[PDB]
Structure formats: structure tokens, C-alpha cells
Amino acid sequence: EIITLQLGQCGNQIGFEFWKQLCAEHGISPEGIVEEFATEGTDRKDVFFYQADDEHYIPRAVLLDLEPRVIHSILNSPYAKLYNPENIYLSEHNNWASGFSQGEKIHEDIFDIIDREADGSDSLEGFVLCHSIAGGTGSGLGSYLLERLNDRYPKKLVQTYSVFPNQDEMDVVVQPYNSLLTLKRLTQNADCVVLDNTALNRIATDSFSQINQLVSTIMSASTTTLRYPGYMNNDLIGLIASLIFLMTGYTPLTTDQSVASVRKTTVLDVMRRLLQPKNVMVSTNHCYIAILNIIQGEVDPTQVHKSLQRIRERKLANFIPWGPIQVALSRKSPYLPSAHRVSGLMMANHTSISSLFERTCRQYDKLRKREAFLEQFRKEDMFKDNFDEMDTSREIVQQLIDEY
Amino acid sequence: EIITLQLGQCGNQIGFEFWKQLCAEHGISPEGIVEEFATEGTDRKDVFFYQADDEHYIPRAVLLDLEPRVIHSILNSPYAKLYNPENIYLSEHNNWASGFSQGEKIHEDIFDIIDREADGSDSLEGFVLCHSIAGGTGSGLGSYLLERLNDRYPKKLVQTYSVFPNQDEMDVVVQPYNSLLTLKRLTQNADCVVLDNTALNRIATDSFSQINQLVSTIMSASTTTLRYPGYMNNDLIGLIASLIFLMTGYTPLTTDQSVASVRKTTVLDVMRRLLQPKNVMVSTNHCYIAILNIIQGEVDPTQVHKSLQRIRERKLANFIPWGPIQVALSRKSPYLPSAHRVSGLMMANHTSISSLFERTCRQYDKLRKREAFLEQFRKEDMFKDNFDEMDTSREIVQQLIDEY
Amino acid sequence: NLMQTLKKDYRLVEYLQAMRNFFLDTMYDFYTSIFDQNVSFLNVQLQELDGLTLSYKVPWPVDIVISLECQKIYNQVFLLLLQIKWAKYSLDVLLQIHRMFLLRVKLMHFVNSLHNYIMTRILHSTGLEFQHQVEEAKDLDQLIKIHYRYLSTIHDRCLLREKVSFVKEAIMKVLNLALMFADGWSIEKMESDFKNCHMFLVTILNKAFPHLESLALS
């Protein structure tokens, strides 16, 4: 089992479309009813859903937000009735310090909800977090929740889908501070999926609805095998151990109109495609640390071995000199059309990601020398006296970059 | 297996009608479907096509062009859906230097496409190139691709169907430069089929649609035996070794209206007809270097031996004094009507082809003495400083003529 | 006629499919409880270092197929499989200071690669072929042979019958590194052993009979 903590407008939407994808996959009706064709289903549902006496299924989700508008719109959707009104929380009434201050203020009810959800699962495995690191809501609230959660639950995993601000595009003027602080908290508490609007929209090209549909696709494909038990990799901890910051790529990212080219898609061509920098959805002979490829559809392990052999000989990849990939196979949901003969998802750890922080650090250093937009931060208690928090966070990020 | 690289308007069309001929021969539907009568076919299809999970077959073709109009028209044809939209490439936005500069600029995506296509074949044998040497697009782009391909793939054949500019007709005012440079690159990198509009249209007489239909006929008849496995000559390398610049001729170049004269066509009369300069589709006791005759239809090797004996005695041909032909037999496709009892195609290497370059050299020398139309070339980086490239190319062509 | 009335009506084939399913999901929760003993404690857990003999109940119409000496072989592969799930999960549940992590990936890989070999390449290759074979059963006897030609071959590919003290013990002794390193949570004296036994493993398996090369890459 698992819980999802989605914050800010970004996280709220991310959750909306993630649950849309999930209910589509598992044959869950918008109202929580189960379709007749899926009555005898074999798919495991406990992982993301828990059924109710009324036979309906409820997501293990909690909605958090500093503002009402987004969730109010969500509850006007056809999927509104599905969620649990008890879990959803809205502030009665764009800065990280303010977000963390509110988090300190509203500890009690949030952790009440979290405890209630936790006690309903026998074998909870970890946590899932969806949020954006730039905006005031996501950054600060996620920081506070991560801190108090790692404190509260020292034996549960914490996984996040953190969305990083666009850089080529000059959105949050105060983004460097929030990003740097959120990164501090991620290193200091997060167990383990980086995301950026820049490269994501780049691949989308070459509305937020479609972008986050792709993101939800990534999340669902990541959790597929856990959802669909097989032989190997039957747990999230198995995933994490096989890799341990990450980046992702998915081959069949094709529009509903781009099915006309039914290209004979082997496993070799897919696994190859997952390697190119173009497909890496995120934007010094930098090299890899780990690679995992989850493959959906018919697959012959002989083909997998041949592809691995050929790629190894062709040396299209580079590895650490000081240490000695993985190809897991799953089964598609029996419901969604198998427009793709075989499909592939890749999650990897690669040193080049360091550059991200070097940019943000460069951004942050490009402001701290002139004290820009610190007036609001001084208002909050945390930065009321000084900003030693900022210095510690910057040095922590520098240490991480040095370690990479 | 094999790949086709067609450039410029000439190459784009050439490819269109070549694939039209191929799909006609192999019973491939315009949409890529296979006809019912051809379900149990014995013809080998991997050579030029690869099938898809949807049962449709996709050509191993890539479309390149500096301009959109031609390919846009192609995609409005009934054959549009057949091609692979992924492989097709169009420049988002008439000189060789500009073409090579763009080739330097768009290396990455082109070679991405080429690698993707290559990795889908187990036993790729060589490359096929179709282009015109006069126009800016074909000349420069083919030059760049040949250079970077011979660099990238040092163990694959490179075959071209190069179209030469008309000379009796005064089309590209700057043709001498492009032709000379393309010839430099062909000698310096090309493994192995000269083509000219002048003699081609001469034989056609005595629109581009019909001319290139004839050209595609030549190409298909050249590749027949490879397409249709037999006993001998079961590989392109076998072809090349048996000969090694070339010229071609085809006997049954008859209109759809000229079938009324069903002339009793032996093998002897055909193979004889392939020898005359009239049938050589291209325009010092110059002599031959090599001759190959591929014969389609019923054939008795006794007849072949008798024809060879008689022609040898009649000494209608001349050979090199310093060195010691070949007649291969194939089978017609079981589908197209056998309006011809027996048909013949000839590919030969003959010293007289030297004259071509002597003309172009004479053309080029007729301009370099007065610096005509060099203003545009100086614009590009390659000819920004000097034109030593031109001098080296001219001397290389002179060396080739001396060698002949 | 006999095979016809044996698909249902004392469905011997249906019972056989369940057999190789309740071991070789469900059995994930079962073993995880054993990680954190008593002989009755396990039963309620099941109904929910090398022991745990497992058995089953077979009706007379299928007793002749799944014999008594057939239970032990099915039990043999189950015991060894768990030790792999053990080491794989023990090094997975957790999450010169950081130098230990380099000993993790250098090891969490190796046990993971082996597990990918036994289950997928063997316990699923012959399994996919076996089902395609039993569905064409046309005899009382040959159904035993096609079945007996499934264990005595899966006990050979999974190296457990012979060459144990020559090859199998190597994988066994390095499995003790998965136990020792798990508890501690001397460090330099581990890689001197690890780089030796792992090289001892490849420099011994290098004799490759031919199917061993599918893992010999690492």
C-alpha cells in the first residue's frame, strides 16, 4: 500500500490526472463503481485504492492547498464524487517562508488525516509526494510535511515527483529561494523523480492537461509492476535498492492521432530509444549511475539478452569507473487498447543532473549578493531574525554537487 | 537488406516511382496491405521492406529535402500512408556550398534517423543513393551525407543513381561547380550508376513521370535477382565484384501502347540489343571494362552459350588489351503481365564515360578563368576564405580522367 | 477418452497449475513475516537456516501423476528460491561513511542478477513450454514423461544436483556475505574477500553446460 501527498496547484492537478489514469487502467468507474466486464478482475487494487462497503473504491489520496479554486474545480468534475471529502483539506482563507509557517500552524489536522489513512492499511510501504518546488504553496508545505513525516514515521519510504521551474523561460520571480530550500529538505529527508517544464514541453512539442497527462503516464508506468504482481520486483523497496536523484523517459509518448504509424516495435529498438538524451524528459565526462527499463507487452527474454549484448558492445552508454543495468518486465492492463506491440519506460540516475543545481545555485548566488525580494521573508518568524537557514541550505547543496 | 537515401526534387521523385514499381512487383497495396492473391507469396520482401505488427510493410526509405513542396505533394498521393512519417524529414525554412553548410548544421537528426533504420536490419548490405548532381539540394546534401557515412560506416556498400545535367540543352547555371564537387566526393567515397537527362529523353522520344518511370524500371531490374533469390549472384557484393563508373540499358523499354508488335524475342537478340550505343541510356579507341546482362523470363543456357559464342566471333565489342563478360539469369515477378517473352538489362563499365567529365571540366575551366557566380559561394563558411576545395576537386577529376 | 474426462471431473490439469503457482502476489507477504521459529505460528500465517519442508494433498485420480518422490523435488527448488528472495529483500528493505553504498551496488547488483536468471530464464522458460505441451496430452503414460521431463531438467539448469562443492558452494558461500553485511548497519576486509570470491566465481564458472553463459556476463 501507499499514500499520495499532493500540494499546490501543480500537485493537485498531477493527482487529478494520475487518478484518472489509474481508474482508466483498473476499470474503476468515475463514481467509484466497478464495471461489469471488470467484475472478475485479477489486478491488485489495494495498492492505490481501498474498497468501501458500498462496493465503491476510494483513493488513498489527500488534497492540500493554500487556495480553494483548484480543488473546487476538481469537485465540479465528473470524478468529483470519487475522492474522500474527509481527507480533502482547504485553507479557510507565493512564498516558501509563509508556506512553512502555515505548515507549523496546521500540523494537527493534516497529521490527523494522515494517521487515519495510515491505520487503514496493513502493509503500507512508503509515501508518494507530488508538488512543484517553485511556487510558495508546494515548496514550503512539502518542506514542512517531509520534515515532520521523516520525524514521525522513521520506517516508511518517501518518493516524490518534484517539478522544477523552467529556466530558458525566465515563472516564480522568487523561485531560487524556494527551489534551494526544497532541495535542502529533499536531500536531508527524501528517500528518493526530478521533473522540469522546459524539457517536458520540449518533448511534448517535438495545455497543462496534456503535460500532466504525460507525467501521470510516467507515474503509472513506474508503479505498474507493483500494481500488477509478477515474479521479480514485487515491491517499491526492490525498485529503490536497484538504483540508489533520478530522471525518466517513456518511448510510446504518442498522441491519440499519431497511431497511424504502427511501427514494428521490438524490445531492442525501445530499450535503445530510452537511452538518448532527447527522450530524457528533463533538460566533466558525466556518466550514469544506474539504469532501469520496465517493458510492457509481449517480451522474449532472448530478445532482451540480445539487445543488452548489442548495446553493451556498441558502448552507447558510459558508466562509473569505480563500480560495476536492469531490465524488468511487466504485463499491460487487460483493458486499455494495446496500440503498442511492446512499450518501454526508463528511470535512471546520471551524474549530469548535477548541472540543474549548479544553475539554481548560480541563480541564487546571483540574488543573495544584492538582497532581492527578502522583504516578505523577513515577515515570517522563521526568517524574522536572520537567514542562516539559507546559508546552510546553500552549503548543503554545494556539498551534494561536490559529492556528485 | 538495404537503405535508400534520396535527396532533392529529383531524388524525392525517383524514390516515389521506384517504390511504386516495387509495390507493384511484390503485390503490396498502396496503403501497405497485402493482397489476398499474394498471401502465400514466395518473393523475399525484407530486402526493401520491413513488415509491421499491423501486417503492413514499410519501405526502408528516408526522405530528405531543402523544400517542402515536393514531399507535401507526395503525401497527398494515394501512396502517402505507405511511407514512415518518422523517417521523412523536411527543412523548416540552388547552391552546393549552402547545401553542405546545411548538412553540417542538421547532422544530428539525419543520423538519428539513419541509425534507427539501420538497427532494424540484421544483415544490412549497403546503401542506395538517388539524387541529382546539378541542383543545390542534391549535390551538396549528398556530398555531406556520403562523407559522414563513409566515415561512420566503414563496412557498408554505397550505391548511387546520380543524374547528370543535360548539356546539349544549355538547367542549373552554376551546374559546373556542383557537378565537379559531387564527382570529387563520388570518387573519394562512393563504392559504385551514371544517369543523364539528355540521352534518357532521347531514348524516351525515339513528363518527368515517364522519365523517372524508366529510371525506376532500371533500378528494379538491377535489384531483381537480389529480391528474387536464385542460385548465383545472391548478393549486391557479388554484383559489384563482377564489374569493378557505370552505364545502363534496358531492352523492353516499350510504351503501354507499343505491345502490339509482339516480336518473337530470343535471348540472343536481346543481349545483342543491349550492346548498341543507342540503348546505352547515357549520352582514342575507347573500349569496355566490364559487361553484365541480367535476363528475365524463360531462358535456356544453351541459347545463352550460343549467343555468347556468336557475339564473340562477330567481335561487335572491344575489350582492354591488358586484361581478360557475364550473363546472369533471374525470374520475373509472378504478378506483372509477362508481355515480353524474354527481357534483358545491361550494366557495363566502358572507358568512353571519361568524355562526360572532360565536358564538365571544360565547362568548369570555361568559368574559373573569369570568376563567374562565385559571390554566393563566398557567403558560406566553406568557401568563405578561399576555394582550394575547388582546385583539389578539379585535380582529382583530372587524375581520374588520366587513370581512365 | 481418459485425458478428455481428466481435464474436468477430477481435474488433474487444474490442480497441477495451482501446484507450481502457490510457490515459485501471495507468497510475498508470507515470507516477509518470516523475516522479522514456531511450527504452528507459520500455519495461520500461510492460511492467511534451510528447513521449512512443504507438502500438499492430492486426490487418488492425480496421485499417480504427482508422486511422493515428486513432492521433494518441488520442495527442493522452493527452499533454494527463498534464500534468494531473502538476500534480495534483506539488501532492499533498508535505505569512508558513504563508502558502504559502493559495497551495496557492487553486491545488490550481483544477487539481483542471479535472481533475474533463475526465475525468468529458467523458472519461466521451461514453464511456458511445459503448459504448451500438457495441453496436447494424449496418453496416461506420456503425461508422466512430459512431466518428469520437466523436473529432472529444471533441477539441472538450476544447479542443485551435482557439481555442488565445485560450483554451487561458491554461490552458497558468497550468499553468506549477504547475511553478514546485512546485520552490520572490517569494512576494508570485505572487498578483499568480495573481489576474491566473485573473481573466484567467474574464474571457476569460466569452464562453460552451455546455458550458464546467460549469467556469465556478471
UniProtKB/Swiss-Prot annotation, chains A, B:
Keyword Transmembrane helix part of the UniProt annotation: no
UniProt GO BP: cytoplasmic microtubule organization; meiotic spindle organization; microtubule cytoskeleton organization; microtubule nucleation; mitotic cell cycle; mitotic sister chromatid segregation; mitotic spindle organization
Residues with Phosphoserine modification: 123
UniProt PTM: Phosphorylation at Ser-123 by BRSK1 regulates centrosome duplication, possibly by mediating relocation of gamma-tubulin and its associated proteins from the cytoplasm to the centrosome.
This protein's GO CC annotations: apical part of cell; cell leading edge; centriole; centrosome; ciliary basal body; condensed nuclear chromosome; cytoplasm; cytoplasmic microtubule
InterPro entries in alphabetical order: Gamma_tubulin, Tub_FtsZ_C, Tubulin, Tubulin/FtsZ-like_C, Tubulin/FtsZ_2-layer-sand-dom, Tubulin/FtsZ_GTPase_sf, Tubulin_C, Tubulin_CS
Annotated TM spans: none
GO molecular function: GTP binding; identical protein binding; microtubule nucleator activity; structural constituent of cytoskeleton
Complexes and interactors: Component of the gamma-tubulin ring complex (gTuRC) consisting of TUBGCP2, TUBGCP3, TUBGCP4, TUBGCP5 and TUBGCP6 and gamma-tubulin TUBG1 or TUBG2. TUBGCP2, TUBGCP3, TUBGCP4, TUBGCP5 and TUBGCP6 assemble in a 5:5:2:1:1 stoichiometry; each is associated with a gamma-tubulin, thereby arranging 14 gamma-tubulins in a helical manner. Gamma-tubulin at the first position is blocked by TUBGCP3 at the last position, allowing 13 protafilaments to grow into a microtubule.
Similarity comment: family membership: Belongs to the tubulin family.
Disease implication from the record: Cortical dysplasia, complex, with other brain malformations 4: A disorder of aberrant neuronal migration and disturbed axonal guidance. Clinical features include early-onset seizures, microcephaly, spastic tetraplegia, and various malformations of cortical development, such as agyria, posterior or frontal pachygyria, thick cortex, and subcortical band heterotopia and thin corpus callosum in some patients.
Function field: Tubulin is the major constituent of microtubules, protein filaments consisting of alpha- and beta-tubulin heterodimers. Gamma-tubulin is a key component of the gamma-tubulin ring complex (gTuRC) which mediates microtubule nucleation. The gTuRC regulates the minus-end nucleation of alpha-beta tubulin heterodimers that grow into microtubule protafilaments, a critical step in centrosome duplication and spindle formation.
The protein, known as: Tubulin gamma-1 chain
Organism of provenance: Homo sapiens
Swiss-Prot record, chain C:
GO biological process: cytoplasmic microtubule organization; meiotic cell cycle; microtubule nucleation; mitotic cell cycle; spindle assembly
GO cellular component assignments: centrosome; ciliary basal body; cilium; cytosol; gamma-tubulin complex; gamma-tubulin ring complex; microtubule; spindle pole
Keyword Glycoprotein: no
Compartment list: Cytoplasm, Cytoskeleton, Microtubule organizing center, Centrosome
Tissue: Widely expressed, with highest levels in heart and skeletal muscle and moderate levels in brain.
Keyword Ligase: no
Taxonomic superkingdom: Eukaryota
Predominant localisation class: cytoplasm
Alphabetically ordered keywords of this record: Cytoplasm, Cytoskeleton, Microtubule
GO molecular function: gamma-tubulin binding; microtubule binding
Subunit structure and binding partners: Component of the gamma-tubulin ring complex (gTuRC) consisting of TUBGCP2, TUBGCP3, TUBGCP4, TUBGCP5 and TUBGCP6 and gamma-tubulin TUBG1 or TUBG2. TUBGCP2, TUBGCP3, TUBGCP4, TUBGCP5 and TUBGCP6 assemble in a 5:5:2:1:1 stoichiometry; each is associated with a gamma-tubulin, thereby arranging 14 gamma-tubulins in a helical manner. Gamma-tubulin at the first position is blocked by TUBGCP3 at the last position, allowing 13 protafilaments to grow into a microtubule.
Family as reported in the entry's similarity comment: Belongs to the TUBGCP family.
Role, per record: Component of the gamma-tubulin ring complex (gTuRC) which mediates microtubule nucleation. The gTuRC regulates the minus-end nucleation of alpha-beta tubulin heterodimers that grow into microtubule protafilaments, a critical step in centrosome duplication and spindle formation.
Record-given protein name: Gamma-tubulin complex component 5
Originating species: Homo sapiens
Full-protein positions shown: 705 to 1016 of 1024
